[PDB]
């Protein structure tokens, strides 16, 4: 295929493809979950070529946040907030906990990141 940089609205329409993709990746990697990576407005964070990712279900939210913090090389004083499908889980939860809470007919997980929480 080809790389693209567009919002979820693109894959929000082909429900048949979104399901097929979720179904194939669920069977290919059931110990992992497909995650959408998107930056929210008002943020002050660098961009990286990451749109669609796959993470293990057993990864603790605090650890996951740390890996991405180090990935974006933010200052230690730099604020950072993550939102999984409009919700804010505790850092003691795991990717499998939020994946269960977000279980959909498409089987995709949406994750947003920002410097400040501003709709």
């Amino acid at each position: 295929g080809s790389p693209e940089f567009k919002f979820q609205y693109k894959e929000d329409h082909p429900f048949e493809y979104r399901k097929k993709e979720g179904e194939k990746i669920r069977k290919k990697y059931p110990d992992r979950v497909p995650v959408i990576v998107e930056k929210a407005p008002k943020a002050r964070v660098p961009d990286l070529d990451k749109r669609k990712y796959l993470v293990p279900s057993d990864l603790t939210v605090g650890q996951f946040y740390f890996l991405i913090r180090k990935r974006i090389h933010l200052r230690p004083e730099d604020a950072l907030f993550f939102f999984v499908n409009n919700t804010i889980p505790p850092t003691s939860a795991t990717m499998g906990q939020l994946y269960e809470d977000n279980h959909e007919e498409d089987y995709f997980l949406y994750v947003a990141y920002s410097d400040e929480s501003v709709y």
């Binding site: 990746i25 992992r32 990451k50 669609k52 993470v55 890996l67």
Partner: peptide, 18 residues
């Protein structure tokens, strides 16, 4: 449609041997 791939679908996995 009906997909007929061989290679897995495009998704960046982040899972090293560690």
């Amino acid at each position: 449609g009906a997909m007929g791939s061989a290679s897995s679908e495009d998704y960046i996995i982040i899972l090293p041997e560690s």
